[PDB]
């Protein structure tokens, strides 16, 4: 994180895509740092689905610069997410503020 | 000639891991110039004790990561690097750590011995977060001085280490941080007597009563050349 | 508001502290702004180009 | 410019100082009264020259 | 030693200075002769020029 | 094999051997310029702060 | 390897002069070329142990502001250059010795009444100049123990002591290398000393003041 900011961050973090972030909400099913798994709440989930979202997480790969991009968790099990909170960090992210 | 020697007089551990110590009475100057000397050796000298390998049971290589665990295996590493023991009378040794089961895992797990001594159990290693989730691994520490990084140990090493070992470096220096303060002190009924106080933050493995004196001997032993000159 | 801030830390308010230097512990003469700056590393590293 | 600021700042003469007006008889003593702390570097003072 | 003025005070011409340096030093590398100097295994481009500062070397040599 | 000789050798042979160093572009005859070189480990030139 | 850090030995006495020398040592280990060269600076420009001249008692002043004739330079610069003269004391705390001299010319340390119990080592240090047909001066030079240099903060004449024989102590650190690695010290020291002692025996001298307060710590 940097210390000293303008609030932009939590939103380049986030817009860029890079950041895994949760298409619905629910709840923390479980969590390695390769997947996370979130079982989604029944107030918005479609009808005939299992209703879970895996999230497989980009682990170490090349940037088109060589620099690698390896995505983490910021969740914990059993822990609730909401639609749009972020998952899990990109590069050069944490919490998914921004960080150089 | 008028010269006072010093008699390290006190010790206060604040914490299992911070410590007081101090020297009195001292001359003009012999404040500011042990008070220096000591802390710049005490920061680059000082012996320690830190893991210098790590094998784990099915990596094979820093940037994998294991099923079940909150932790790509290189953070991992970063973590077990900050890890402090003492060792009892040996260059080296090999702790074995397993947990299974949902939760962290912590240095209260690695199998405990007479001869290593650990000076804080809740240091965290991972989490784990799946019920048959495991982790068995093989750190190995090693004694020694300075900061060694494994670019150049394994470049010393000379010969091929085997596949599925992971690295760490080496950082066996044990104090953190070291202040030094100079003041007056009633000593004979007179004045310009420096109470020297060395305070210092640490890792935990070693006690000021050893250390001043252990950078004393350093500095005592390294001065020889300029009387035997 | 940013002294405002150091003051509600326990932190000098001007900013500056008074360093020492850790080759003879003398002090230096007069205080020096001591602060945490954000800085980056950037994609031009050496080994890379030498 | 690093070099000049050093060589401004101790050539200057400040009207206030530690060891100001003492006579000196040479450079020597001069550091040797600098770097035990004893007088200012730019306090003004009398010294032997050649 | 490095700088090479006080061998320009005995070559008037800085010129004939690299010419005459080359040269002796190419006697002493190449033609196998031994310098006049004391030598104290400096490089023949330093030997040559050390030569000079002995003010026992011109292009007659 | 860079074995533990060689080194011994180079500081024998680059012992005064200028090496020419300079920039680019370079404008006029101040912007090549010859030095002694003297060895480093790290991996940057190590240029004169004046020049 | 644990505890069997890398000496020096002396690469050079280096001598140029008997008055100064430049003493280096290599290897140290990283940056302890401070950690000695400046701790043995620190003690020895200003707590090694010493004899110098105190006080002064020329014939008849109150103040070398007082410009008496006879002499070229003034009281002001007498007064100086006697804080010039090195002198050694043997087993006193302080001895007053008296000067006189007489005849148009200079005048010398030489000329000092030498009790043998004190040695001037440097008698051809000029003290001043006189000027008329009639020129002759006679004064008391206080020689006293100390330590250090001591400023003028505390008929008399106060003057500085210069107790310490150190006229100058300088140091650098830099690079030196064995087969594998750079990042050691070479140490380089630089003194000058007023004669009363040679300076690669002064360090030995200051070595020991520093080794004696570890004394109480080393096992």
Redesign the interface.
Known sequence: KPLVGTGMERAVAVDSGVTAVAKRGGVVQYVDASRIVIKVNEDEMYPGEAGIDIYNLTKYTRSNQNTCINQMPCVSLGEPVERGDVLADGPSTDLGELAL | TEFLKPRLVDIEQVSSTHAKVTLEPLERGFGHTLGNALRRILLSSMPGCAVTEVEIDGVLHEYSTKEGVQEDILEILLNLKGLAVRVQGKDEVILTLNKSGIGPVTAADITHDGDVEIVKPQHVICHLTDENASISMRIKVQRGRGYVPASTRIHSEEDERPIGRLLVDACYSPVERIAYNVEAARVEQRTDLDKLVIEMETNGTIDPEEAIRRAATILAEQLEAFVDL | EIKELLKLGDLPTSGQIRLYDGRTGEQFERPVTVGYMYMLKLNHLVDDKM | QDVVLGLYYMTRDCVNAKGEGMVLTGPKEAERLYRSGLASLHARVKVRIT | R?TVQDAVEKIGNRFDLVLVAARRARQMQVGGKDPLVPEEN??T??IALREIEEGLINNQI | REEAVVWDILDEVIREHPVLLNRAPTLHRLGIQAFEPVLIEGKAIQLHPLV
């Open positions: 490095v400096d490089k481009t330093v």
